[PDB]
Amino acid sequence: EFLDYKIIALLHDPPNKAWVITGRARNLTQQLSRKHEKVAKYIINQLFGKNYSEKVDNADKLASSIDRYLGSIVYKERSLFENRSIFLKNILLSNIQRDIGNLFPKDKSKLDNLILEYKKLLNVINKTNLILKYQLFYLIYELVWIDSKYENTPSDTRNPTHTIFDHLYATAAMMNWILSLEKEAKGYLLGIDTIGVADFISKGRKTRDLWISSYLVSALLWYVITWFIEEYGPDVILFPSLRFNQFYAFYLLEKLRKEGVSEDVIDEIKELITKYIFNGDDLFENLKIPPYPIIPGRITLILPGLIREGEEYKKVQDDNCFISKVKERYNEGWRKLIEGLRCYSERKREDGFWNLVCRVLKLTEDLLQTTPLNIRVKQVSVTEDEIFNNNKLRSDSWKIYDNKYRQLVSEFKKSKLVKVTPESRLKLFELTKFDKLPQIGEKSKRGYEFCTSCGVLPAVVIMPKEDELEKKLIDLGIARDEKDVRSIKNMISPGERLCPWCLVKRALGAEPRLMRILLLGDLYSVEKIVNEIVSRDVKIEIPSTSDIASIKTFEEMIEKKNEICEDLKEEEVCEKPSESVLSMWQWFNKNYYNGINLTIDPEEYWFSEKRRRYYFSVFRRHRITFPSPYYALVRADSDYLGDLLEGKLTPYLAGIIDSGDYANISEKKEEVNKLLEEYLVNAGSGSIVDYVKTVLKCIRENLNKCSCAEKIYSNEVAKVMFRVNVEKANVEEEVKNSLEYFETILNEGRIIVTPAWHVSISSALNRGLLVELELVNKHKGFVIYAGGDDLLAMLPVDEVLDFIKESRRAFAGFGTEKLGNMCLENGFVRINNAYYPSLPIVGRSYSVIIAHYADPLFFVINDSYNLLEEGKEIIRYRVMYNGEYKDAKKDVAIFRYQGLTSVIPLSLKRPIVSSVSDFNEIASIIDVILELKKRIDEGRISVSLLYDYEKYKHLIVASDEKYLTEFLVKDWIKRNSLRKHVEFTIDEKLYGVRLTIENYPIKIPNDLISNIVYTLRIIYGGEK
C-alpha cells in the first residue's frame, strides 16, 4: 500500500501561519486568488495536493495538546480568542518568551523566492524515488527556512509554547498511526535500549578504545534505525529527533552521492548541513565519518502497522514482526562489520598488525559471531477501538499516546531489573577447561590470561614484556619478520593481552573509516565501502590521556617554538609535519601547523623514564613549566530527563518531589498543583488566559464538578458571538471537556504527553548537543560521546571548572557569545533570527574525575558512573523554595581526586528558572571558585587560604546572622592574603547550604564554603 501521505502533513500548515492567521501582510493570500490553508495549499505545488479528510484533521488533533488546552472547536477557529501579537513561548517554562514581529515571506515576490529553492533542491531526485524527496525535504525543511533569514513562529498565537516547525514534524510522526488505523488498524510505539552502555565504554586501555567502543554504540544502533528510515522514511523516529542529527545528515549526503545527483546540488545542500547540522566544521568531509559519536542510547519509534515484502506495504503479519526484525537487524551490523574488517585486513595482508588481525579474525570466527553490546527491544500497540468512535476521534482519545508511552517506559524499567552482561552469551566452558583457546603470542603459564581491556574474557593475543620484543615477536607466530614489529607495537603495547572483542575495538581504532559499513547501511556493498578505504591514506590520530595531560605544555612550546627549537633539532619536537593527518579533536586539528609535531607520544618524552630529566632540563632553560600527569574526565548527564518525557514534574522540583512520589501524587498535592496551575496560566497568553484562569480557580478543593460553566460559560459564550460562524459549539460541553482536560492534568500531577511535547524536547536535545560540542572544543577537550543529554569528555584539569560553568548555563539556554552559528538568548537558542527553545528547568549534574594519565581507564569510567549515578542519587542540599528552605537532590557537579570529594550545587533555587532573571545565577558558585582560583595563582591570595578555613569554619557554620558571616569570610580571606588590595566577595546567598549524604562511602563536608575549599584542593591537586 502506497501511503506516503506524511508530506501532506509536513506542509499542512506553512511556516507563516501566525502572520497569515490574524493577518499582518494579508496580501500574499491576496496575490494568488479558510484563509491559512490557502497559503498552505499554494506552496504544495510539487506533487499531490492537500486532502481535507483523515490526513491532517485527526492527526493535527493528537499531534499536540493545543487542541485540549485551548479547546477543540476554537483551536480550529482562529476566531474570537484572537491576539494580534506573535509571541513565542518556551515549552518547559512559560515566563520566558521571544517576540516574532515580522520576518517572513510577505508577498508572492518573496514567497516564491524560497519555493524555487525548495524545488531546486528536490528537482535532482528522480520523481519515482519519492523516498528521497521526503528524506531530503525532511531535514532541509527548516534549514532552508533558517538560511532565508526568517523568525521562527509558534504553532498557535493563543498558546505560543510550540514552534510551528516542531508541531509540523509532530503531526507527521503521528501520521503513521492515523494512516495505519484508517486501514486495517494497528499502530506501535517501538522502543530500543542498549543494556550497559557505560560498561561497554569502560572496556579499553586507551582513549581510541574508549572512542571506538563509544562509536560502536551509535553505529550499531544507527544501522538498525536506518532500516526504518528506508522503509517508512523519517518521522518514525521520535528519539533521537532526526531534524538535527549529525548522523542522519551524513547518511543523507551519501545517499545523494549514491545513484547520482547534481554535483552542485549535493554541494548546494552541503553548505546547509555544514552551517546548521554541524557548525562550520567540514571535518567530517575530510574524516569521511561523523566526527562525534552521538549516542542516542534510548530510541523510541512510532511505527504504523504496515509491513513491506509484498513489494509494497500490507497488514503486519504478527505483532512480533518488529521485535524480531530489530534483533536480527542489530546482529547483522555486527556481522557486516566483522565482514568488512576481515576483507579490509586481508586487503592489507602485509604492513604488520593486520597479518595479526587476519590471524585472529579467522581463528575466532565463532566468538565474533556474538554482538558485544546486546540491545533490548520493547513494544506496545494501539487499535482503532482505542482511538475512533466510528471513523472520527473519540473523547479521551487525546490521552492514548500518553498512556501508550507510559506502558512502554514501564516495560523498560521492568526489564532493567535483570542485568545480563553481553559476555554471558558467549560459550567459553570447553575453551577454558581444555586448552582449546587460540592464543596467538605467549602461552599462558596459568591458564588463559584474561584480557587487559575487558578483564572478563580470556585473551587471544598475548604480548611479551619489554625484555625485548623483536627476538620474542619474530620467533613466535606474532611477527613474521622484524619490519612489522614497529607496526604492531604502534597499535598494541608490549605486555597487553587482548580478547577477540577488544582487538576488534583496536582494529577499528586503527581504521575508523570502517565504521561507514554501519553508518550508511544497505547503501553500498561491503566491498565498495572497503575499496574507498584502501583507495586512500587517511590517517586519523586520536589523543590519549597523556596527550590531554600535555595541552598547556604543547601550547607553551608552540609559542616559544624558535627558542625551544634549535637545541633539539632532532627529537621530533621540531619535526615538520610530513603528512596531512587529521583528528576529530578540534585542538589537534586547530594547531598541527606550528612546526611542533603534536603526534609525538609524550611517554617517550617528558612523561618517559629514559628521557624525563632531559626534557625537565630542556623545559627548565626556556621557562616552560613541566607538565602535570593529570587530566579531567568530565561526564555530564541531565537530571530526570526520561522522567520528564513522562510529563512528570520531578525535573522542576528535584528533591522536593522525587520519582517515588508519583506512586501517590496526593501527598505532594500542594506543590504539584502550585506549579501545574502556574504552567497552564502562563502558557496560552492573550484573551484566552483569563478564561483558563477561572477554570483552574473552580477546581482547587474538590470544587464544582462541572458546575463551573456558570463562571466560564460567560467567558466563552460572551466570546463566541465575536464572529458569526459557530456551527454546533455546545458551550456547556466545550467548557466541560476543557474542565475535563485540566482535571486529569492536576489529578495525575503531570503534563499530558503528546508527540509535539516529545519532538520539541527531542529536537532541543539535539540542538543543545551542538552547542555542547563547541564548548568541549573551546576548552581544548576531547569528546568521547555526547548524545543528547549525556556527555563524556576528557578536559585538561585547567579548563574543567569554567567548562562546567559555561556548559551548565548553555544547557539552560543562557550564555555569552555565540559558539557556532547559534547564540544563547536567556533560554532560547537562536540560529539566524530563528528562536528555538532549550531546557532551562532540567537540572544537569556533572562528575569530574581528576585522574593520572596512567590510571586504568576501566576504573576511572566505572567510578564516574558509580560516583555520580549512585552518589548523585543520595546528595541533598538546602535549596530555597518559595521562601522556604527545602532539601533538593540533583544538579550537583561532583568532583573527585583519589579520595577527596567535593559537591558544588548549581541551582540553589528549586524551580531552577522561573523568570529571565534566574539565569545569571545558575552555576553561580562555580565562578566563586573560578574567581578565587584566579586570585591565588596571581599571588593575590596565598594557597594557605585553603588550609586555614578549618578554624573559621565552625564560626561560619554556627553563625546564623548574615551580617556577621560576611565579616568572618572577609577576615578569613584577608588574613592569609598576600597583598593589601584584594577585595574578594562571596555572593552571600551561599551562607548555609548543609550538603548531607545518607550513610554512604563518600564523606562530604556539610557546608558549601567548605566544599568550595575542597574543590580548589582537588583542582590544585591535579596540577602537581
Place of cell 581504521: 511
- Name which of another protein, Zn ion, none residue 502 binds, using a CB cut-off of 5 to 8 Å depending on partner kind: Zn ion
Longest Cα–Cα distance of the chain, Å, equals 97
Shortest Å distance, C-beta 364 to Zn ion: 12
Q: Please give the Cα distance from 330 to 332 (Å, whole number).
A: 5
* Cβ distance to another protein smaller for residue 458 or 686: 686
- Name which of Zn ion, another protein, none residue 453 binds, using a CB cut-off of 5 to 8 Å depending on partner kind: Zn ion
Q: Is 743 helix (H, G, I), strand (E, B) or coil?
A: helix
Interface map 487-516 toward another protein (x if CB under 8 A): ------------------------------
Q: Is 887 annotated as a binding residue?
A: no
Determine contact, residues 76/60, Cβ cutoff 8 Å.
Answer: no
User: Minimal CA–CA distance to 503: which of 358, 702, 319, 658?
Assistant: 358
Single residue of 280, 447, 495, 595 touching another protein by CB under 8 A? 280
Q: Is 869 annotated as a binding residue?
A: yes
* Cβ distance to another protein smaller for residue 275 or 940: 275
Single residue of 101, 310, 447, 495 touching another protein by CB under 8 A? 101
Q: Is 102 in the site for another protein (CB under 8 A)?
A: yes
Interface map 918-957 toward another protein (x if CB under 8 A): --x-------------------------------------
Q: Please give the Cα distance from 505 to 219 (Å, whole number).
A: 13
- Name which of Zn ion, another protein, none residue 681 binds, using a CB cut-off of 5 to 8 Å depending on partner kind: none
**Judging by DSSP bridges, how do beta strands 894-897 and 844-852 pair with one another?**
parallel
Q: Is 454 annotated as a binding residue?
A: yes
Shortest Å distance, C-beta 623 to another protein: 25
Single residue of 355, 589, 685, 738 touching another protein by CB under 8 A? 589
Q: Is 438 exposed, middle or buried (0-12, 13-18, 19+ CB in 10 A)?
A: middle
Q: Please give the Cα distance from 845 to 904 (Å, whole number).
A: 10
Interface map 563-582 toward another protein (x if CB under 8 A): --------------------
Strand order of the β-sheet with 884-888 is: 884-888, 875-881, 996-997
Q: Please give the Cα distance from 818 to 986 (Å, whole number).
A: 29
Size, binding site for another protein by CB under 8 A: 32
Shortest Å distance, C-beta 821 to another protein: 9
- Name which of another protein, Zn ion, none residue 312 binds, using a CB cut-off of 5 to 8 Å depending on partner kind: none
* DSSP class per residue in 420-457: --GGGGS--HHHHHSS-S--BSS--TTSS-B-SSSSSS
Q: Is 988 in the site for another protein (CB under 8 A)?
A: no
Q: Please give the Cα distance from 902 to 897 (Å, whole number).
A: 9
Per DSSP, which regions of 687-744 are E strands?
none
Single residue of 80, 408, 823, 930 touching another protein by CB under 8 A? 823
Shortest Å distance, C-beta 596 to another protein: 15
753: which DSSP letter? P
Shortest Å distance, C-beta 419 to Zn ion: 19
Q: Please give the Cα distance from 416 to 642 (Å, whole number).
A: 14
- Name which of Zn ion, another protein, none residue 833 binds, using a CB cut-off of 5 to 8 Å depending on partner kind: another protein
Single residue of 337, 508, 824, 906 touching another protein by CB under 8 A? 824
Single residue of 523, 880, 900, 916 touching another protein by CB under 8 A? 916
Point out which span in 12-20, 101-109, 455-463, 922-930 binds another protein (CB under 8 A).
101-109
Q: Is 453 in the site for Zn ion (CB under 5 A)?
A: yes
- Name which of Zn ion, another protein, none residue 101 binds, using a CB cut-off of 5 to 8 Å depending on partner kind: another protein
Query: What residues does 633 pair with on adjacent strands?
Result: 794, 849
User: Minimal CA–CA distance to 461: which of 472, 447, 445, 450?
Assistant: 450
* Count of residues making up the chain: 1024
Single residue of 35, 119, 149, 620 touching another protein by CB under 8 A? 149
Using CB positions, name the residue nearest to Zn ion.
Answer: 454
- Name which of Zn ion, another protein, none residue 825 binds, using a CB cut-off of 5 to 8 Å depending on partner kind: another protein
Dihedral sign, CA of 560, 563, 565, 567?
A: negative
Shortest Å distance, C-beta 338 to another protein: 36
Q: Is 845 in the site for another protein (CB under 8 A)?
A: no
Instruction: Provide the 10 A C-beta neighbour count for residue 495.
Output: 12
Q: Label each residue of 527-578 as H, E or C.
A: HHHHHHHHCCCCCECCCCHHHHCCHHHHHHHCCCHHHHHHCCCCCCCCCCCC
Q: Please give the Cα distance from 290 to 979 (Å, whole number).
A: 51
- Name which of Zn ion, another protein, none residue 260 binds, using a CB cut-off of 5 to 8 Å depending on partner kind: none
CA distances from 869 to 636, 846, 852 (A): 11, 10, 22
Q: Please give the Cα distance from 904 to 926 (Å, whole number).
A: 8
* Cβ distance to another protein smaller for residue 24 or 1017: 24
Query: Contacts with Zn ion in 759-818 (CB under 5 A)?
Result: none
Q: Work out the angle between the directed axes of helices 164-182 and 130-147 (0-180°, nearest 10).
A: 160
- Name which of another protein, Zn ion, none residue 282 binds, using a CB cut-off of 5 to 8 Å depending on partner kind: another protein
Query: Contacts with another protein in 237-266 (CB under 8 A)?
Result: 263-264
Helix (H) or strand (E) holding 655: none
- Name which of Zn ion, another protein, none residue 454 binds, using a CB cut-off of 5 to 8 Å depending on partner kind: Zn ion
Shortest Å distance, C-beta 101 to another protein: 4
Shortest Å distance, C-beta 832 to another protein: 7
Q: Please give the Cα distance from 251 to 258 (Å, whole number).
A: 11
Interface map 3-42 toward another protein (x if CB under 8 A): ---------------------x------------------
User: In the numeric block, which cell numbers belong to residue 542?
Assistant: 586520536
* Cβ distance to Zn ion smaller for residue 424 or 525: 424
Dihedral sign, CA of 913, 918, 919, 923?
A: negative
Q: Is 109 helix (H, G, I), strand (E, B) or coil?
A: helix
Q: Is 163 in the site for another protein (CB under 8 A)?
A: no
- Tell me the one-letter amino acid at 983: E
Kindly report whether the peptide bond that precedes residue 240 is cis, defined as omega within 30 degrees of 0. Answer: yes
Dihedral sign, CA of 932, 938, 941, 946?
A: positive
* DSSP class per residue in 483-506: TTHHHHTTTS-TT--B-HHHHHHH
Interface map 796-815 toward another protein (x if CB under 8 A): -------------------x
* Cβ distance to Zn ion smaller for residue 367 or 676: 367
For residue 903, how far is the Cα from the chain centroid? 24
Q: Is 451 in the site for Zn ion (CB under 5 A)?
A: yes
Q: Is 502 annotated as a binding residue?
A: yes
* Cβ distance to Zn ion smaller for residue 422 or 1022: 422
Q: How many helices (H) and strands (E) does the chain have?
A: 38, 21
Q: Is 973 annotated as a binding residue?
A: no
Interface map 489-508 toward Zn ion (x if CB under 5 A): ----------x--x------
Shortest Å distance, C-beta 202 to Zn ion: 11
Q: Work out the angle between the directed axes of helices 500-510 and 323-347 (0-180°, nearest 10).
A: 60
Which residues are near another protein by CB under 8 A?
Answer: 24, 85, 97, 99, 101-103, 149, 263-264, 267-268, 271, 274-275, 280, 282, 589-590, 815-818, 823-826, 832-833, 916-917, 920
Which residues line the annotated binding site for Zn(2+)?
A: 451, 454, 499, 502
Which residues line the annotated binding site?
A: 193-195, 451, 454, 499, 502, 637-638, 869
Which residues are near Zn ion by CB under 5 A?
Answer: 451, 453-454, 457, 499, 502
